[PDB]
Amino acid sequence: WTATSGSCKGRCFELQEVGPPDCRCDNLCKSYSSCCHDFDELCLKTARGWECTKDRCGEVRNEENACHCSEDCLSRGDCCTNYQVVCKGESHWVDDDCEEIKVPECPAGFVRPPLIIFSVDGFRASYMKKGSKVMPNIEKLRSCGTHAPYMRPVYPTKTFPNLYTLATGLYPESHGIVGNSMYDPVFDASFHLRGREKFNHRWWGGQPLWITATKQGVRAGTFFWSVSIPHERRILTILQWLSLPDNERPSVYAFYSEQPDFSGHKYGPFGPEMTNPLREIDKTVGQLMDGLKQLRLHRCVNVIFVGDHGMEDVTCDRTEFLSNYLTNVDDITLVPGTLGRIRAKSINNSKYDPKTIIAALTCKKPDQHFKPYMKQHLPKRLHYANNRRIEDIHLLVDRRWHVARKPLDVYKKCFFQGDHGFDNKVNSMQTVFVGYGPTFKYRTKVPPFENIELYNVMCDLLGLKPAPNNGTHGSLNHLLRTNTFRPTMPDEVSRPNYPGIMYLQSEFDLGCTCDDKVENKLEELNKRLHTKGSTKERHLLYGRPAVLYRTSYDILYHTDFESGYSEIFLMPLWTSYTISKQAEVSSIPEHLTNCVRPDVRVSPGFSQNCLAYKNDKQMSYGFLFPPYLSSSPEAKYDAFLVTNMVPMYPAFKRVWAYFQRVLVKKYASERNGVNVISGPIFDYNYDGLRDTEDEIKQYVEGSSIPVPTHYYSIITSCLDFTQPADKCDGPLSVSSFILPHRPDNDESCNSSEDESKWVEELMKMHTARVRDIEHLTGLDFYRKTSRSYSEILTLKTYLHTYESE
Ligand SMILES: *[C@@H]1O[C@H](CO)[C@@H](O[C@@H]2O[C@H](CO)[C@@H](O[C@@H]3O[C@H](CO[C@H]4O[C@H](CO)[C@@H](O)[C@H](O[C@H]5O[C@H](CO)[C@@H](O)[C@H](O)[C@@H]5O[C@H]5O[C@H](CO)[C@@H](O)[C@H](O)[C@@H]5O)[C@@H]4O)[C@@H](O)[C@H](O[C@H]4O[C@H](CO)[C@@H](O)[C@H](O)[C@@H]4O[C@H]4O[C@H](CO)[C@@H](O)[C@H](O)[C@@H]4O)[C@@H]3O)[C@H](O)[C@H]2NC(C)=O)[C@H](O)[C@H]1NC(C)=O
Ligand SMILES: O=C(c1cc(OCC2CCOCC2)nc(C2CC2)c1)N1CC2=C(C1)CN(C(=O)N1CCc3c(O)noc3C1)C2
Ligand SMILES: [Ca+2]
Ligand SMILES: [Cl-]
Ligand SMILES: [K+]
Ligand code: NA
Ligand SMILES: [Zn+2]
């Protein structure tokens, strides 16, 4: 109930909401059908349009007009945005040359530069180049300010999940808005685009920017606009808010445009009908900037122009139907479209089995345009699993396609030629970032970055302390002239032990054997020096990683590699080695095929054993430093140490062997040496965070040897590839992956073929940021470089995506 008989006189676009049954006058009241009776008359005036004309100049104030050309309008704060151009011979902001804003040039009484966030739905990154002739205001912002060639949305690349990621710095799994459509079983409720349930606060986790601002005494303009409120009125309302007295004036403002998403759905991303919506967004930007210039705020305010996601070509005929795969298609609920989420239609059906559904969807058709996953098997870079609202079964749908349940769902609902929601590495899903103002840099290009990083920056721009989030604070310091946040490396929590030779061969009863009984003081001092860390500067280029939790571990040195060996997990947490451009691949000699050797620096009781592997019929083993890349026949014995051993399903060893035997060498050749850090990951509860021992669900049978869920590698070299990796004087270049450790290769539909036809494609799918690996391991990499910490943080957030230009 709303007693809609109160009035909006004097309250148009009021900044505090008021409680039912009092009638409302704020920018959201329409959407709650709670505006007072006179809201349209008083607050949504349209008379005479939005631009001054010559004949309106000097006019007698008529309060019915939408905006004013009278002489008192600047002081009233309600001129049309073009008032000074038409009536005072001033130029449009876009027509002025751009001049560096070295300091904020603000009116008296402004305590800090305001922030205005201009967000555009569906603004695909390539629109900046492809639409540049029709968006001159936006291009001025872009080329005078700071810009990225694109910004990476989060998965799914839907509107609500991304807008709220922009608001919070959080992955959808953490903030709760895991789709545009959702079911929450604890609430027993559903969240739809259409309706009232989405306004209930319990869907929305984290702490969005407006709440962060409010709690720390920064005033926020209300971010959300009811869809009927036209764009021109939203701009004028912001400009009016900026004229408020110092004690009532907000410091942060938001404008949201439904375009160009709305049209892109209809016409496709590059449909000829798309030119006009781009013109119109540009015109709106023009109005804002002309409005700010009138208020002498155009060298005071920081303006962010940011998109939520791009848009891709998608038509009804490119739909896959689950009815062409499953027999039991009525026993499932599908959340459909550019991604697929499947659950049981009824929780009183005990005959529902996800395993059989997945198998019925796996590699069934040769050209298949989706891939099923249990959510915990999705690529870790998507961070799309740790929420009750994400269904156990997920379909990653190919770009340009839809998935639906039955054909009746497509025709009883072609209409659309554009959609989004695909994997966030897809080019067509990328979106835009431009920052313009005193706090942003002048004429600067920055590298692409992920939209989860922006919450921190917006907090920096307003002098707020960010709530805990998934950004890496400092990774975008390079966007900012000032207001930088100066981060420090986390403290190491556990220091290593450096064990020497403490145990005799015969103390070990591991069931391991090695044909190594083959015996010189020249090469005996030499190997002592290799066990004490003589070659470590070669193999450990960036310092040892820091262990950020309490544990017991040993640094072990070898001729070709260095490891941090965990007495708790009975394996390395990390193995570091350098492979030069010139290095050579050998094979494992025949006599050493099954060779595993006791490590005389580590007790039997903190060692794996071979018997467990023999008794575990599912589980085999592999090595972290590969025997194939040994520098000499003698050094190769080090690679068969029990302390280099890790558990591997036979199906995973095909992947791992190919990576170690072929791909490491290929990368060394191409990148002029590489440093490699490899290791295990345990994420049984799929939260993206390092497991404690008591969370491990699987061990090598009859042993305390825990089974990793994944294996990682971080592959570093010199960005200037004319310098070798081991003697790089400048910035670094990195690619990483987090491979799922799976007992089959069902994910790769061509896995019965040679490893050269599928292994690399799989690795690409599971590309990762170093930072993802940090979360999953509790390690901190790149502790000892000559590079600034900001630059390293930027490096740690880099993702190698393998899309073309
Ligand atoms: C990305 O960044 C984010 C933010 O930094 C990271 O997420 C944080 O991770 C922390 C560690 O996992 C986590 O800390 C826990 O908080 C528990 C209390 O949390 C409440 O309060 C906070 C603070 O305001 C609030 O934000 C939380 O909101 C969550 O839940 C509501 C739903 O009720 C949602 O609206 C909201 O979206 C959010 O949901 C998300 O997070 C929860 C986890 O909190 C997930 O389960 C959801 O799926 C969803 O993703 C909460 O309202 C606190 O109780 C925990 O403490 C337990 O564990 C500690 C270990 O130190 C142990 O010592 C304690 O004994 C305690 O155990 C007890 O409870 C156990 C479980 O019931 C029980 O088994 C035990 O026996 C004990 O009884 C813990 O400290 C923090 O909440 C989240 N924050 C957010 C916003 O998600 C995220 O990790 C980053 N991602 C990556 C990949 O790095
Ligand atoms: O005002 C907001 C808004 C704006 C908003 O900014 C947050 C800012 C945080 C700081 O950084 C910049 C963004 N945050 C929210 C939610 C997260 C808290 C909401 N609205 C969004 C939408 C509408 C208006 C209408 N609507 C649709 O018509 N579609 C529904 C979604 C959709 C789709 O996926 N494709 O077409 C459509 C059509 C989506
Ligand atoms: Ca975990
Ligand atoms: Cl969705
Ligand atoms: K075995
Ligand atoms: Na397969
Ligand atoms: Zn859309």
Closest C-alpha among 76, 8, 775, 7 to residue 383:
775
525: Cβ contacts below 8 Å, ≥ 6 apart: none
In the structure encoding, which two tokens stand for residue 710, read together?
A: 């994944």
Amino acid at 58: G
DSSP reduced 3-state for 281: helix
Pocket test for ligand 1, best of 174, 201, 549 (most atoms within 8 A of CB): 174
Which bin fits 70, alpha (ψ -120 to 50), beta or left (φ > 0)? beta
Ligand with smallest separation from the Cα of 371: 6
The Cα-based distances of 624 to 224, 565, 653 in angstroms read 52, 11, 11
DSSP reduced 3-state for 305: strand
DSSP structure string for 101-140: --S----TT-SS--EEEEEEET-BTTHHHHTGGG-HHHHH
Nearest-atom number in ligand 2 for the CA of 119 is: 12
Q: Where are the beta strands (DSSP E) in 401-539?
A: 402-404, 418-419, 431-436, 444-445, 449-450
C-alpha span between 640 and 137 (Å, rounded): 63
Dihedral over Cα of 148, 152, 157, 158: its sign: negative
Nearest-atom number in ligand 1 for the CA of 174 is: 50
Amino acid at 727: K
State the residue range of the domain holding 616: 505-797
Ligand with smallest separation from the Cα of 264: 7
**Please, are residues 254 and 235 in contact by the beta-carbon 8 Å criterion?**
no
The residue with tokens 């957030």 is 797
**Please, are residues 278 and 127 in contact by the beta-carbon 8 Å criterion?**
yes
DSSP structure string for 524-570: HHHHHHHHTTTTHHHH-TT-PPEE-S---EEEEE-SS-EEEEETTTT
C-alpha span between 596 and 616 (Å, rounded): 17
DSSP reduced 3-state for 755: helix
This PDB structure is determined at a resolution in Å of 2.1
Pairing mode, if any, of strands 115-121 and 302-307? parallel
Residue 706 DSSP one-character state: B
C-alpha span between 573 and 693 (Å, rounded): 13
In the structure encoding, which two tokens stand for residue 226, read together?
A: 């009811």
802: Cβ contacts below 8 Å, ≥ 6 apart: 425, 764, 767
Which bin fits 722, alpha (ψ -120 to 50), beta or left (φ > 0)? alpha
Q: Where are the beta strands (DSSP E) in 639-751?
A: 645-648, 674-681, 710-718, 732-740
**Please, are residues 279 and 134 in contact by the beta-carbon 8 Å criterion?**
yes
CA of 711 to the centre of ligand 3 (A): 14
**Please, are residues 423 and 396 in contact by the beta-carbon 8 Å criterion?**
yes
DSSP reduced 3-state for 85: helix
CATH of the domain at 713: 3.40.570.10
The Cα-based distances of 714 to 691, 733, 743 in angstroms read 20, 11, 23
Closest C-alpha among 784, 668, 797, 642 to residue 724:
668
**Please, are residues 626 and 558 in contact by the beta-carbon 8 Å criterion?**
no
For 35-186, where are the alpha helices, taking DSSP H only? 39-43, 73-76, 83-88, 127-130, 136-144, 159-168, 172-175
In the structure encoding, which two tokens stand for residue 565, read together?
A: 């060996």
CA dihedral 257, 312, 275, 138 (to 10 degrees): 50
C-alpha span between 690 and 188 (Å, rounded): 31
Closest C-alpha among 629, 499, 518, 608 to residue 564:
499
320: Cβ contacts below 8 Å, ≥ 6 apart: 368, 369, 370, 397, 401, 402, 403, 404
710: Cβ contacts below 8 Å, ≥ 6 apart: 380, 680, 681, 683, 738, 739, 740, 741, 776
C-alpha span between 494 and 554 (Å, rounded): 11
Phi, psi for 514 (deg, rounded to 5)? -150, 135
In the structure encoding, which two tokens stand for residue 652, read together?
A: 């995973």
Start-to-end CA distance of the chain, whole Å, equals 55
CA of 242 to the centre of ligand 3 (A): 46
Ligand with smallest separation from the Cα of 683: 3
Omega into 172 within 30° of 0, i.e. cis? Answer: no
Amino acid at 580: S
Closest C-alpha among 312, 311, 291 to residue 303:
291
Ligand with smallest separation from the Cα of 386: 1
CA of 16 to the centre of ligand 4 (A): 32
In the structure encoding, which two tokens stand for residue 95, read together?
A: 């027509």
Nearest residue CA, atom 10 of ligand 2? 167
Closest C-alpha among 42, 14, 20, 15 to residue 33:
20
Q: Is the C-beta atom of 68 inside 6 A of ligand 1? A: no
C-alpha span between 327 and 519 (Å, rounded): 66
Burial-class residue 731 by CB neighbours within 10 Å (0-12, 13-18, 19+).
Answer: middle
Q: What value does the CA radius of gyration of the chain take, rounded to a whole number of Å?
A: 30
Q: Is 687 a known ligand-binding residue? A: yes
C-alpha span between 290 and 94 (Å, rounded): 8
Specify the DSSP element, H or E, that contains 770: helix 770-777
Establish how many alpha carbons lie within 13 A of residue 501's alpha carbon, considering only the half-sphere containing its beta carbon.
6
Ligand with smallest separation from the Cα of 472: 1
**Please, are residues 393 and 375 in contact by the beta-carbon 8 Å criterion?**
yes
C-alpha span between 459 and 115 (Å, rounded): 10
C-alpha span between 580 and 676 (Å, rounded): 11
Closest C-alpha among 388, 297, 400, 394 to residue 336:
394
Pairing mode, if any, of strands 767-768 and 732-740? antiparallel
Q: Is 420 a known ligand-binding residue? A: yes
Q: Is the C-beta atom of 153 inside 6 A of ligand 1? A: no
**Please, are residues 357 and 326 in contact by the beta-carbon 8 Å criterion?**
yes
Q: Is 685 a known ligand-binding residue? A: yes
CA of 262 to the centre of ligand 7 (A): 6
Phi, psi for 223 (deg, rounded to 5)? -75, -20
C-alpha span between 781 and 778 (Å, rounded): 10
How are the residues of the chain apportioned to helix, strand and coil, as percentages rounded to the nearest 5? 30, 20, 50
Q: Is 27 a known ligand-binding residue? A: no
DSSP reduced 3-state for 150: strand
Specify the DSSP element, H or E, that contains 797: helix 789-797
In the structure encoding, which two tokens stand for residue 239, read together?
A: 């400009």
Q: Is the C-beta atom of 148 inside 6 A of ligand 2? A: no
The residue with tokens 């670094």 is 732
C-alpha span between 128 and 717 (Å, rounded): 32
CA of 377 to the centre of ligand 6 (A): 15
Closest C-alpha among 664, 655, 622 to residue 640:
622
Instruction: Return the HEC string of 294-335.
Output: HCCCCCCCEEEEEECCCCEECCCCCEEEHHHCCCCCCCEEEE
In the structure encoding, which two tokens stand for residue 172, read together?
A: 């959808």
CA of 174 to the centre of ligand 1 (A): 9
The Cα-based distances of 581 to 529, 675, 721, 729 in angstroms read 25, 11, 11, 17
Nearest residue CA, atom 17 of ligand 2? 164
Q: Is the C-beta atom of 199 inside 6 A of ligand 2? A: no
| Listed residues: CB within 5 A of ion ligand 7 | 261
Burial-class residue 427 by CB neighbours within 10 Å (0-12, 13-18, 19+).
Answer: middle
Which bin fits 415, alpha (ψ -120 to 50), beta or left (φ > 0)? alpha
Nearest residue CA, atom 30 of ligand 1? 205
Omega into 21 within 30° of 0, i.e. cis? Answer: yes
C-alpha span between 375 and 392 (Å, rounded): 5
The residue with tokens 């949201």 is 256
Q: Is 121 a known ligand-binding residue? A: yes
**Please, are residues 666 and 715 in contact by the beta-carbon 8 Å criterion?**
no
C-alpha span between 741 and 763 (Å, rounded): 12
Compute the C-alpha angle 644/648/654, nearest 5°: 105
Q: Is the C-beta atom of 223 inside 6 A of ligand 2? A: yes
Q: Is 308 a known ligand-binding residue? A: yes
Q: Is the C-beta atom of 11 inside 6 A of ligand 1? A: no
Omega into 260 within 30° of 0, i.e. cis? Answer: yes
Q: Is the C-beta atom of 119 inside 6 A of ligand 2? A: yes
CA of 754 to the centre of ligand 6 (A): 12
C-alpha span between 300 and 253 (Å, rounded): 14
C-alpha span between 240 and 221 (Å, rounded): 11
Buried b (16+ CB within 10 A) or exposed e, 23-49: bbbbbbbbbeebbbebbeebbbbeebe
C-alpha span between 350 and 353 (Å, rounded): 8
C-alpha span between 638 and 516 (Å, rounded): 11
DSSP reduced 3-state for 303: strand
- Sheet with 370-374, strands from edge to edge, namely 332-335, 339-344, 393-397, 370-374
Pairing mode, if any, of strands 767-768 and 779-780? unpaired
Burial-class residue 246 by CB neighbours within 10 Å (0-12, 13-18, 19+).
Answer: exposed
The Cα-based distances of 174 to 179, 182, 200, 687, 793 in angstroms read 12, 14, 17, 9, 22
Distance of CA 436 to the CA centre of its chain: 23
C-alpha span between 343 and 392 (Å, rounded): 7
Distance of CA 313 to the CA centre of its chain: 23
Nearest-atom number in ligand 1 for the CA of 383 is: 93
The Cα-based distances of 536 to 49, 121, 533, 582, 669 in angstroms read 73, 51, 5, 19, 22
CA of 337 to the centre of ligand 2 (A): 19
Helix axes 789-797, 770-777, angle to 10 degrees: 90
Q: Is 261 a known ligand-binding residue? A: yes
For 562-700, where are the alpha helices, taking DSSP H only? 610-615, 650-658, 664-671
C-alpha span between 432 and 128 (Å, rounded): 8
In the structure encoding, which two tokens stand for residue 196, read together?
A: 């009232």
Catalytic residue list:
159
Q: What is the number of other CB atoms lying within 10 angstroms of the CB of residue 487?
A: 15
C-alpha span between 739 and 43 (Å, rounded): 57
Q: Is 419 a known ligand-binding residue? A: no
Q: Where are the beta strands (DSSP E) in 358-494?
A: 370-374, 393-397, 402-404, 418-419, 431-436, 444-445, 449-450
Pocket test for ligand 2, best of 121, 222, 237 (most atoms within 8 A of CB): 121
Q: Where are the beta strands (DSSP E) in 409-479?
A: 418-419, 431-436, 444-445, 449-450
C-alpha span between 178 and 215 (Å, rounded): 26
**Please, are residues 768 and 680 in contact by the beta-carbon 8 Å criterion?**
no
In the structure encoding, which two tokens stand for residue 636, read together?
A: 């190769």
Nearest-atom number in ligand 2 for the CA of 177 is: 17
Specify the DSSP element, H or E, that contains 231: helix 231-241
CA dihedral 348, 352, 353, 359 (to 10 degrees): -150
Q: Is the C-beta atom of 338 inside 6 A of ligand 1? A: no
C-alpha span between 708 and 742 (Å, rounded): 10
Distance of CA 342 to the CA centre of its chain: 24
DSSP reduced 3-state for 330: coil
Pocket test for ligand 2, best of 163, 204, 433 (most atoms within 8 A of CB): 163
